[PDB]
Amino acid sequence: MQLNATFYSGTCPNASAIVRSTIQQALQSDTRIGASLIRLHFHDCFVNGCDASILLDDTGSIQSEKNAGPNVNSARGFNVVDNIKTALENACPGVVSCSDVLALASEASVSLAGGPSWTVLLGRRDSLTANLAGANSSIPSPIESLSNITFKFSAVGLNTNDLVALSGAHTFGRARCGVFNNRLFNFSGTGNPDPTLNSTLLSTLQQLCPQNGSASTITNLDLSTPDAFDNNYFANLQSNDGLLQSDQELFSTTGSSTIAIVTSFASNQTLFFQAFAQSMINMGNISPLTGSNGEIRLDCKKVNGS
Numbered sequence: 181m182q183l184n185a186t187f188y189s190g191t192c193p194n195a196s197a198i199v200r201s202t203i204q205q206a207l208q209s210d211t212r213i214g215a216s217l218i219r220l221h222f223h224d225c226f227v228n229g230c231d232a233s234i235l236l237d238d239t240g241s242i243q244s245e246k247n248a249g250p251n252v253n254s255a256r257g258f259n260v261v262d263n264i265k266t267a268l269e270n271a272c273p274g275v276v277s278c279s280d281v282l283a284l285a286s287e288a289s290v291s292l293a294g295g296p297s298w299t300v301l302l303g304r305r306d307s308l309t310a311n312l313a314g315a316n317s318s319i320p321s322p323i324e325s326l327s328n329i330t331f332k333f334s335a336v337g338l339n340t341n342d343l344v345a346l347s348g349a350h351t352f353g354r355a356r357c358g359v360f361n362n363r364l365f366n367f368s369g370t371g372n373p374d375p376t377l378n379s380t381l382l383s384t385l386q387q388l389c390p391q392n393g394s395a396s397t398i399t400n401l402d403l404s405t406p407d408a409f410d411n412n413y414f415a416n417l418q419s420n421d422g423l424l425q426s427d428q429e430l431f432s433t434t435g436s437s438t439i440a441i442v443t444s445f446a447s448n449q450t451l452f453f454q455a456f457a458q459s460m461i462n463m464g465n466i467s468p469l470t471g472s473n474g475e476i477r478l479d480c481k482k483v484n485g486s
């Protein structure tokens with residue numbers, strides 16, 4: 181059973197519209213929501229495939245993924261996912277799955293943010309279980325080596341091209357102090373700050389994230405255009421303005437093939453969009469539940485019958 185773009189064509193003709201419409205409203209009170217929703221789709225596909233398992237909440241038997249290191253005090257926008265699901269539920273009762281919902285939301289979010297559009301493949305069914313442990317070992321960390329990070333991407337089915345391109349989703353969105361302050365004062369026990377981090381920026385961050393201050397203070401992943409989906413994320417890397425250690429590693433790791441891909445995207449926005457749109461379909465195609473597998477949740481937070 182293969183995913184396709186006209187799967188809900190006869191049952192929910194305007195699904196793409198409803199999703200877009202809802203998000204564009206949420207974007208009225210939260211410019212950040214665009215980047216938050218796409219990340220959820222990211223975290224969903226890297227664990228047990230794109231099955232919307234990340235949306236399930238804790239119950240006696242379900243150990244919610246929302247608690248894995250990557251998600252706890254980080255993942256957000258679940259309330260909006262429900263608003264999207266509700267709209268879809270009024271217009272199209274029991275039709276659209278939460279898995280497809282996150283896939284559709286990702287496209288709409290990038291789109292409204294000024295980014296590319298792409299034919300979204302639908303037909304995913306919702307899982308009946310979550311995977312907390314797998315979320316802790318399958319999702320890459322910003323302090324992991326470019327090597328370690330590449331590996332985890334191979335494990336789900338994405339290559340180096342998919343890596344650099346999908347890393348551009350950091351062109352907008354936020355990140356807390358705790359996920360990068362390691363580069364601000366004593367980087368890897370050397371007594372000094374990460375040398376691949378621009379000097380001007382470093383200072384601004386040492387103030388934003390003092391050694392004893394809150395680890396949950398946030399800043400923009402892209403100091404250039406915090407909410408616009410453009411190719412600046414890569415321009416930033418060239419100036420050593422990459423926020424996350426994983427970000428800069430894509431460009432400042434001498435002798436890596438990722439360097440040409442980065443300079444390519446920072447040089448031509450069309451290429452980046454094409455590659456990105458491409459790598460987004462690819463990630464959406466990971467281990468999906470189809471046919472008689474999984475179900476179509478009426479409420480994304482729990483399994484039906486619960």
Ligand code: HEM
Nearest residue numbers: 215216219222254320321322346349353354355356359426
């Ligand atoms: C290659 C490895 C990656 C690493 C190490 C990584 C790491 C992170 C971290 C640590 C944050 C900040 C979370 C926080 O501070 O609470 C973040 C935010 C974000 N990431 Fe990634 N990320 C990666 C790949 C991706 C991919 C593939 C996408 C999507 C296609 C993505 C989309 C986002 C977005 C849009 C945000 C902002 C979310 C928000 O502002 O709420 N990330 N990422």
Ligand SMILES: [Ca+2]
Nearest residue numbers: 224227229233
């Ligand atoms: Ca998942």
Ligand SMILES: [Ca+2]
Nearest residue numbers: 351402405408
């Ligand atoms: Ca941007």
